[PDB]
A paper describes a structure:
Cry11Aa and Cry11Ba are the two most potent toxins produced by mosquitocidal Bacillus thuringiensis subsp. israelensis and jegathesan, respectively. Cyt1Aa, Cry11Aa, and co-crystallized Cry4Aa and Cry4Ba. Solubilized protoxins are activated by insect gut proteases enabling binding to gut cell membranes, subsequent oligomerization, and ultimately gut cell lysis leading to larval death. Cry11Aa and Cry11Ba structures maintain the three-domain organization characteristic of Cry δ-endotoxins.
Cry11Aa crystallizes as hexagonal plates and Cry11Ba crystallizes as larger bipyramidal crystals. The phases obtained from single-wavelength anomalous dispersion (SAD) were sufficient to reveal the Cry11Aa protoxin structure at 2.6 Å resolution and subsequently enable phasing of the Cry11Ba protoxin structure at 2.4 Å resolution by molecular replacement. Regardless, phases were of sufficient quality to reveal all Cry11Aa residues from N13 to the C-terminal K643. The in vivo crystallization pathway can be best trailed from Cry11Aa crystals, which feature a single monomer per asymmetric unit and build on six packing interfaces burying a cumulated surface area (BSA) of 3515 Å2, corresponding to 13.1 % of the total protein surface area. Perpendicular to this axis, another two-fold symmetry axis relates dimer A-B to dimer C-D creating A-C and B-D interfaces. Using Tb-Xo4, a caged terbium compound, we could phase the Bti Cry11Aa structure by SAD, from ~77,000 diffraction patterns collected on crystals consisting of ~75,000 unit cells on average – an achievement to compare to the determination of the Ls BinAB structure from >370,000 patterns (native and three derivatives) collected on crystals with ~100,000 unit cell.
Numbering used by the authors:
A (entry chain A): 13 to 643
B (entry chain A): 216 to 643
C (entry chain A): 323 to 429
Write the structure that this text describes.
């Protein structure tokens, strides 16, 4: 607090690398099972990873890590309560785990053991859903639902071997199909509640809480929605956000209407330049020196002019900033005083300049060092800033040395650099800030904050090459909907972090059509005779008479891959196309314009639908194991 | 002003016939001009020819496939030195087309002050007025001076379009200085009555034409920048300047009123031939520009120049009741391909889920305009009915190389029975 | 104090003193129209000595108004029978300045 020690992503000691958190081996094995499930054997492994040695020791490691990230701490009484519920789950699972490992056991015996385990988990689940402590317990809730949903799938697959009749399995399928939805709803209920509450205090606080869920909660929620299949890929592409600066409250309606859009900029483009509006002054000789951050201007595609200033880029107000075809970079004013005795010849300084930092030769910044120092004076608080991006010192404070604030995450790079408007209403231009065809910007006298988004390394190829490259050696590919080649107008950015991506497209055009296109190229050695299938993840809350249509476009060769009836349903649904090969689509190793198109007709006023992600999977590696239509 | 006056003449006496020349080899197409007439009111501003096609024409057209819904004016009045007479200034012009696109910005400037802001509290500042008072016992100069800076708003009428206007400017010399006084009227709405004295009328109107665009030309600044950045879409069509001191009005012919009202092309049974200017598109791809091709007897052509994804323009087509869907039709495409396109140019029908290829044409290099004719088809084949609301015609090509480009001019839809090629163009 | 009514240029120049500078500004929105036009006023107020050579009494008072950390002001000025300033912020109670057997010499 009152020390000048180095910080690490705003914290006082280094943070655990995202790949070394206590839930990481549980996620790693989950991804393996999504691609190939080992019947009547996966609940055991998941049991040994969540409760190693029949001990709750790992689950307490998870609690302590979460408590440190969000600066919330459970009381010693609440801790005694959770551990008691862990041991109850352990005992019942020890009985069941032990019995299936006995070769030649009695199937009807395990049936009763199976049922006892399921009810014991269902019974203790509400203990992790108390609203007063949901900021911490949401991570614990996720592991418990994960253990239960795994038990149901194993039971469904190994039916009679565990003493289940065909009416038993049919009962479990209905139970699974309902609880995979109910568990998602209950988790999202806790996340939106605590996030909305924390943002109203401060956006920095709400981002810090969101950074935790991205690592501990949302990757598993996505996994839940893939467990009914075998052969798809589990991959998260959620970004981590570092907020440096003052406190700015934000309602939840303001987060989704304006703020998130300003942070993302051009969601399918890499950053090539960012600029900063900087102020320095010490004109009253008594008051100490001060600095101000007035605006932030990230530039993505240099040919789009989509993103504008957040804050303001006005360096003066005496006349202009363009005129003669040249931008004004720095205005400096000096003033001099003098008296015979005790000469106050200390010349004051006023500085207003735009600071430019081009993207490096490596296309992306790997890390940064940005910090702000507060200084109190009567009723006023002053500011001093330090900026560094990559190896480029942008700003060294003129008010005094400021300790470092190392912003970095192993396995992540910097994609977006934005800021949040300060001192103005965040209620305007929501319905006008679309993905394209509008000026993504907001005016403000200052921002006094800088926000940095770290994207996972699995996204580096797309933001470098502007296309998705398919290999022969992989079986499944995930395509986040925001990694599009082009999109139609009157479409928005929707925050859907439960999908384990950085967002979804909400279409809302009432003329022509709604369309999103994705660029596909083939690496050499690709087998064009292999059969593939395509899965489309959408949500259709209003009826679409003409439906949704997936199509291949390869120069002159256009082909329909699937046309799907779109009935109204407020949950996420999956559409699977027939099989095809790449030779049918005419796509080769030299093809440079091949696109996948997902499209619908125009909509009515007040209607909308959502695109989340695409799944490309070899026909041999894919199966539907739990029919979703059996509710 | 002088160059527009000369261009207005050619539009009426020269260019309609040049287009006719390029249809004489056929029998069955339609001769129709859609060139606009431009009224320039204000001071003298020189402009090179490279500046006309790189920036100025684009600023005049705004959103080339949209109708105007609002235009705003930045107005200045002052008589602060009591000796010098009153003066007025036009500082900026902001035409708004699609209210959801934010494509067009100020030409000139919309800054009414510089003491602080113009937004902040979610409300735009409309008028700043400053008064000042003096006094002396004998010969009291109690005449209070006035300084006025305000934004003037004129919404598009209930008839969707203004039919005429009355705008004029009065010059007054004073030592080495020339002063200005302005009068503005649009339709039946008096926007500005001059505070310097009565100004005679200047009736702007052409029988058979209506007002589509209201723009202006930047004054006192270089017109050399942002040419390669001012595309049809995906960029901010604007230019900063201390004043404009001019207003430019474009009158479009009445044969264009249906498209700018309905946003679609309606086909009738009783007609034989239809012309579709390329700028009357439903949507267009990025990195495409406005090209002045007045010899085509239209208001311009699309120059495609995208080096990724694809180059595509789409056109909206609806059917009036009584249309015979069993009639056979053909489609003619007027393009210019100065560089080779290996994968060619492709015409396609898109009607909800029903997409069909109407023609795929070899694109060899040739610096003259060429015509591509598709095979015959019927509208029943394309699945299009009287209730269809999303049917589109797509003309597309692949991505291009750096420095390459091709041009789209117009489309011709003609009944197969009414059309013949009478002079083979391949016999050179 | 200071008699500067502005800082855009001058106060003399053409042989005449500048008495009042008033600035108005106008805003507008379709719904809940904030058409309340703001006002900025800077003026020099003159009060000549009466025909009786001296003012006998006066009525001058100031009203304080608190707002967050800020205190605002409103003034009322009267000399003799001449109302110099009536407050634009609201009514301010009188403050009778007078002493029997005394007159006003200095202000």
């Amino acid at each position: 607090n009152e020390t000048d020690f180095p910080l690490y992503n705003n914290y006082t000691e280094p943070t655990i690398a995202p790949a070394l958190i206590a839930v990481a081996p549980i996620a790693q094995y989950l991804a393996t099972a999504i691609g190939k499930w080992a019947a009547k054997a996966a609940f055991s492994k998941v049991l040994s990873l969540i409760f190693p040695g029949s001990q709750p020791a790992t689950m307490e490691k998870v609690r302590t890590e979460v408590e440190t990230l969000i600066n919330q701490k459970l009381s010693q009484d609440r801790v005694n309560i959770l551990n008691a519920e862990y041991r109850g789950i352990i005992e019942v699972s020890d009985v069941f785990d032990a019995y299936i490992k006995q070769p030649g056991f009695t199937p009807a015996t395990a049936k009763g053991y199976f049922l006892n385990l399921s009810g014991a988990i269902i019974q203790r689940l509400p203990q992790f859903e108390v609203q007063t402590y949901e900021g911490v317990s949401i991570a614990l809730f996720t592991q418990m639902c994960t253990l239960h949903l795994t038990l149901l799938k194993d039971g469904i697959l190994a039916g009679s071997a565990w003493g289940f009749t065909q009416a038993d399995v049919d009962s479990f399928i209905k139970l699974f199909n309902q609880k995979v939805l109910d568990y998602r709803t209950r988790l999202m209920r806790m996340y939106t509640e605590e996030f909305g509450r924390l943002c109203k205090v401060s956006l920095k606080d709400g981002l810090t809480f969101r950074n935790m869920c991205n690592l501990y909660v949302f990757p598993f929620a996505e996994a839940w929605s893939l467990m009914r299949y075998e052969g798809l890929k589990l991959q998260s592409s959620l970004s981590l956000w570092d907020y440096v600066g003052v406190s700015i409250p934000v309602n939840y309606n303001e987060w989704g209407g304006l703020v998130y859009k300003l942070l993302m900029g051009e969601v399918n483009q890499r950053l090539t330049t960012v600029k900063f509006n900087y102020s320095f002054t010490n004109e009253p000789a008594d008051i100490p020196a001060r600095e101000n951050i007035r605006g932030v201007h990230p530039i993505y595609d240099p040919s789009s002019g989509l993103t504008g200033w957040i804050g303001n880029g006005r360096t003066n107000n005496f006349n202009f900033a363009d005129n003669n075809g040249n931008e004004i970079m720095e205005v400096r004013t000096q003033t001099f005083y003098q008296n015979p005795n005790n000469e106050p010849i200390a010349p004051r300084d006023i500085i207003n300049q735009i600071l430019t930092a081009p993207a490096p030769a490596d296309l992306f910044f790997k890390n940064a060092d940005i910090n702000v120092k507060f200084t109190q004076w009567f009723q006023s608080t002053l500011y001093g800033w330090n900026i560094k991006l990559g190896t480029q010192t942008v700003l060294s404070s003129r008010t005094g040395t400021i300790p470092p604030n190392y912003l970095a995450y192993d396995g992540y790079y910097i994609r977006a650099i934005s800021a949040c408007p300060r001192g103005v209403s965040l209620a305007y231009n929501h319905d006008l800030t679309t993905l394209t065809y509008n000026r993504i910007e907001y005016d403000s006298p200052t921002t006094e904050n800088i926000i940095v988004g770290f994207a996972p390394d699995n996204t580096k190829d797309f933001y470098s090459k502007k296309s998705h490259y398919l290999s022969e050696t992989n079986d499944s590919y995930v395509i986040p909907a925001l990694q599009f080649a082009e999109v139609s107008d009157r479409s928005f950015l929707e925050d859907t972090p439960d999908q384990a991506t950085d967002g979804s497209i909400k279409f809302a055009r009432t003329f022509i059509s709604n369309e999103a296109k994705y660029s596909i190229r083939l690496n050499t050695g690709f087998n064009t005779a292999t059969r593939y299938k395509l899965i489309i993840r959408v949500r259709v809350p209003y009826r679409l008479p003409a439906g949704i249509r997936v199509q291949s476009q390869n120069s002159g060769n256009n082909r329909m891959l699937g046309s799907f009836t779109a009935n109204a349903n407020p949950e996420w649904v999956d559409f699977v196309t027939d099989a095809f090969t790449f030779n049918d689509l005419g796509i080769t190793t030299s093809s440079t314009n091949a696109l996948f198109s997902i499209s619908s007709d125009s909509l009515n006023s007040g209607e909308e639908w959502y695109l989340s992600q695409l799944f490309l999977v070899k026909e041999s590696a894919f199966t539907t194991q739990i029919n979703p239509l059996l509710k």
